Structures are given as structure tokens and as C-alpha cells.
Amino acid sequence: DTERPVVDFPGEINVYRGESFEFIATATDNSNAFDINKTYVRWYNGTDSGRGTEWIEKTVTQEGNLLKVKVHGKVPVDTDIGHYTRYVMVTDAAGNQNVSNEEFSARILNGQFRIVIRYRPNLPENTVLVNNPSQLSETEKNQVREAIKQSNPNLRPIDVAGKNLDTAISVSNNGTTTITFRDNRKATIQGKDLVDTRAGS
Ligand SMILES: [Ca+2]
């Protein structure tokens, strides 16, 4: 057996701080036999799960001819916002890896994926009442920003663009709010969830 096994797994997965996740990689091989103990979710220069992503776990089973690699874990509430490149590596019974040790040392490889760590914002319990829901005043925008800050205590200055919560949380004129994180990724909160018209009944 000199044919490498082949992993099928998305090229990008999104996970959220404070939440658990689970994604299934499947692998096939001409021999239908695997060395199950030599399965790794790894980075390019080690078989460990990599610096900053030590919380990535794996569970490996085989169902008939199909190797099933469960990529799972719980993202820490205080891990860094950003993304990483990691790899699902499998080994057939004959010792052939899906990716060679030379390829890792040096183009997307089999089993390669980007894992993006995101923050999911909590909505405030109550909306802010505003005079004109399409022309918020600066005071009303500040009140919306403070409502978001209050409901999102684990969103810290280090997590956002410019290390400044007051400028990274940008409230538009109709209350729709964009948060820009330290990796320049975004979260958009609809204004209908944040503001209501004063005396609108
Ligand atoms: Ca093989």
C-alpha cells in the first residue's frame, strides 16, 4: 500500500468563545484500514494542536470503511480573537499519512482548514427609546453603545479594533451597530433589536 488516505473536511470553520463546537472529518483509503492512534489535529510544525488552540480536541472512530474524526471542544471565553491554519492528519494501516512530513515543512494541503475564533455578541435586555429611529442623536448612540457594553462584559479592549470599545462599537443613524474586532472581522447587530421609537404606540 503506497496510496495516501484522503480527508474530507471544510476549508474554513467558525467557532465562538464560550461555546462548544463539533465538526466531522471523514477519511477514506484504498486499504480501508487506518492506524487510528496516529490521527492528529495539528499545526504545520508539530503534531500537537498548536499554540493558542490547545483546546481543540479530537475523537476518532471507524464506521465500516470510513474513518470519522470528530473535531470538537469548548472555546475559552478569553482566548484570542483571530484565525489559525490547522490540519486534520490521518494515517492508513500501512503508515502513509494523508500529507507528507515534507509538505508540512514547506497551496492548500489535504485536511487543511482555517479555524476562525469569533465573539458572538449578547443583545441588551431592553431597547433604548429614541426620538427618530432613522436619525439617532449622539446621546442616543452613546446609550446604545453603553447598553451593548453592559451586556457584553467579556468583550474587552484587547478583543476590538484599536483597543477602544467606544470606537470599535459603531452605532449608525438607525441604530444598526457594527463591532470591529482586533482581526478586523465584524459583527452586525440589527437596529430593531437595539432601539424603539419613543411614544410610538
Ligand atoms: Ca493507503
Author numbering: 257 to 362, 369 to 463
Can you quote the paper on this entry?
We identified that a previously-uncharacterized SLBR from Streptococcus sanguinis strain SK150 (termed SLBRSK150) displays 62% identity to SLBRGspB but exhibits a distinct binding profile. In short, there was modest binding to each of the three trisaccharides, i.e., sTa, 3’sLn, and sLeC, but little detectable binding to any of the tetrasaccharides (i.e., 6S-sLeX, sialyl Lewis X (sLeX; Neu5Acα2-3Galβ1-4(Fucα1-3)GlcNAcβ; Fig. 1d), and sialyl LewisA (sLeA; Neu5Acα2-3Galβ1-3(Fucα1-4)GlcNAcβ; Fig. 1e)). The high sequence similarity and distinct binding properties of SLBRGspB and SLBRSK150 make these good comparators for understanding selectivity. To reveal how similar SLBRs could include or exclude different sialoglycans, we determined crystal structures of these five SLBRs at resolutions between 1.0 Å and 1.7 Å. We next turned to SLBRGspB and SLBRSK150, which both bind sTa preferentially.
Many streptococci adhere to protein-attached carbohydrates expressed on cell surfaces using Siglec-like binding regions (SLBRs). Siglec-like binding regions (SLBRs) are among the streptococcal adhesive modules that bind sialoglycans. SLBRs contain two adjacent modules: a Siglec domain, which shares some features with mammalian Siglecs, and a Unique domain13 with no close homologs outside of the family. The conserved sialic acid-recognition motif governs general specificity while sequence diversity in surrounding loop regions allows the SLBR to select between related sialoglycans.
